[PDB]
């Protein structure tokens, strides 16, 4: 796989979990004593390519 394909796939996977997190919050909109959850995004490892190390 070209690395650009997998880098974009991580964003698709990350947003997929975000939708599932949002969907649960709207499902429990009438649940008594419920606390909303939010998804937190962070960038992954940054790699030096044009250097041997």
């Amino acid at each position: 796989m070209h690395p650009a394909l997998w880098v974009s796939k991580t964003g698709l996977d990350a947003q997929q979990t975000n939708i599932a997190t949002i969907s649960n919050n709207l499902a429990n909109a009438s649940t008594v004593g419920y606390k909303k959850s939010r998804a937190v995004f962070e960038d992954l490892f940054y790699q030096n390519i044009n250097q041997p190390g």
Binding site: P3, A4, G11, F41, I49
Partner: peptide
């Protein structure tokens, strides 16, 4: 050109990242 494409791809994968 592929390397620059991957660099732009990381930005789009990190649209919702906090403080990015």
């Amino acid at each position: 050109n592929m390397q620059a494409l991957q660099l732009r791809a990381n930005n789009l994968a990190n649209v919702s990242t906090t403080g990015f």
